[PDB]
Design an enzyme around this catalytic site. Structure first.
Site, short mmCIF file in Angstrom:
data_model
loop_
_atom_site.label_atom_id
_atom_site.label_comp_id
_atom_site.label_asym_id
_atom_site.label_seq_id
_atom_site.Cartn_x
_atom_site.Cartn_y
_atom_site.Cartn_z
N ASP A 239 -8.34 -24.06 26.07
CA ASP A 239 -8.11 -23.10 26.02
C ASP A 239 -8.28 -21.45 26.09
O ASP A 239 -9.02 -21.28 25.35
CB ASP A 239 -7.26 -23.16 24.89
CG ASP A 239 -6.30 -22.13 24.49
OD1 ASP A 239 -5.32 -21.35 25.11
OD2 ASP A 239 -5.71 -21.38 23.23
N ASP B 177 -4.20 -17.35 30.32
CA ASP B 177 -4.06 -18.89 29.33
C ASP B 177 -4.43 -20.12 30.39
O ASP B 177 -3.20 -20.36 30.29
CB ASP B 177 -3.01 -18.43 28.77
CG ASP B 177 -3.49 -19.43 27.24
OD1 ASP B 177 -3.81 -20.14 26.78
OD2 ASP B 177 -2.49 -18.97 26.51
#
Ligand SMILES: CCCCNC(=O)[C@H](C)C[C@H](O)[C@@H]1C[C@H](C)CCc2cccc(c2)CS(=O)(=O)C[C@@H](C)C(=O)N1
Length: 376
Positions: free
Chosen positions: A35, A219
């Site tokens: 992440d 992201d």
């Protein structure tokens, strides 16, 4: 030694990409979601219906309790737990072991995904957004401080499912053409500045501040391309116009309902390419990445009579700025060059294929007054 890390990721855009890691002594193996949109390293540490295994602190002789709680709220989903440290390794990564902060997840809400095959999350962003505060050193900062691993990593996310996370460098066999770099505007999220948007070669002609309201980030832990309200409405209006010769279910453009076509008859040609221009490395210079519809029409299984090719619209509205998510990163090799405060993009070796169009990273372009595109 980067060949040891090629193909070390598994998963898909809709449920994330994960790398195998070990925590504790003796090593406990866990699959960890990659992440770049957060900065906490956290693992399920208590039974959960969607977890097949979890971190058992009582079985690790090197576990240390920090006697401090923690919670992380994401755009969607959240967890809370207890902070501590332990020894961490990456079997298909650099041959090192580091003592890192670990949030032991004790309760969670809509965070773990049924059947995702991962049990924790590796937040690769900067300490400024770590919880409970920026004094909790993120994993990658610990890795660089304790070892000689260079301060950068690269991600090759391949759709369909796997990919590569090259820790400490760039593997030239994973991309073609040139790498184009955009500055990391500020070290918190991986924040970048988008300076122009085109759909099928037509400029959206919005104030470029709108593209970065109130930030734009890269992201890996978000499936979709997420766009601020005003930009989302303009993009959907343009995409609808280009594809108006087809009829779409109610809620398709909201990312809710799915659309299907007879096996192999998806009319790709009616969906436009999207070009995002990013601020470059030199004055008045930008470059562009071009996104094909095969990226923003995410293929999903048909639990019913699985005969047709079905997809979900993978562009969604945001109230917290632009998010260049996994469907955008797929097909590109993305270099998180922390040492030089820049992010690089190149066409990936595992790139998406269209019969007449191709994803591309192209430059240089001239773009004036790029500084005005950043939000303040
Ligand atoms: C507190 C300081 C840092 C907070 N950072 C953030 O909140 C980031 C902007 C967002 C994060 O990457 C989070 C990280 C998520 C929860 C990990 C699980 C996951 C993996 C893949 C796909 C989806 C969910 C479905 S999804 O719908 O794409 C979730 C998207 C919406 C999501 O929330 N992703």
């Amino acid at each position: 030694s980067f060949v040891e890390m090629v193909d070390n990721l598994r998963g898909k855009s809709g449920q994330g990409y994960y790398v195998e890691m070990t925590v504790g002594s003796p090593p406990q193996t866990l699959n960890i979601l990659v992440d770049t949109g957060s900065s906490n390293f956290a693992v399920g540490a208590a039974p959960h219906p969607f977890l097949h295994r979890y971190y058992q602190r009582q079985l690790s002789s090197t576990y240390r309790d920090l006697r401090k709680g923690v919670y992380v709220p994401y755009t969607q989903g959240k967890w809370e737990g207890e902070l501590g440290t332990d020894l961490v390794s990456i079997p298909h990564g650099p041959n090192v072991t580091v003592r890192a902060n670990i949030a032991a997840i004790t309760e969670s809400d809509k965070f773990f995904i049924n059947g995702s095959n991962w049990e924790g999350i590796l937040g690769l962003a900067y300490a400024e957004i770590a919880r409970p505060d920026d004094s909790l050193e993120p994993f990658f900062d610990s890795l660089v401080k304790q070892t000689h691993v260079p301060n950068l990593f690269s991600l090759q996310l391949c759709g369909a499912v796997g990919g590569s996370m090259i820790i400490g460098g760039i593997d030239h066999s994973l991309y073609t053409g040139s790498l184009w770099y955009t500055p990391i505007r500020r070290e918190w999220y991986y924040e970048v500045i988008i300076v122009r948007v085109e759909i099928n070669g037509q400029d959206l002609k919005m104030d470029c501040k709108e593209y970065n309201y109130d930030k734009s980030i890269v992201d890996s832990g978000t499936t979709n391309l997420r766009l601020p309200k005003k930009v989302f409405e303009a993009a959907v209006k343009s995409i609808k116009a280009a594809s108006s010769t087809e009829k779409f279910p109610d809620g398709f453009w909201l990312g809710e309902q799915l659309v299907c076509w007879q096996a192999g008859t998806t009319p790709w040609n009616i969906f436009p390419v999207i070009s995002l221009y990013l601020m470059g490395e030199v004055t008045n210079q930008s470059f562009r990445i071009t996104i094909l519809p095969q990226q923003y029409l995410r293929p999903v299984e048909d639990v019913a009579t699985s005969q047709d090719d079905c997809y979900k619209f993978a562009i969604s509205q945001s109230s917290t700025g632009t998010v260049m998510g996994a469907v955008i990163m797929e097909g590109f090799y993305v270099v998180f060059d922390r040492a030089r405060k820049r992010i690089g993009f190149a066409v990936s070796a595992c790139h998406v294929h269209d019969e007449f169009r191709t994803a591309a990273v192209e430059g240089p372009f001239v773009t004036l007054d790029m500084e005005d595109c950043g939000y303040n």
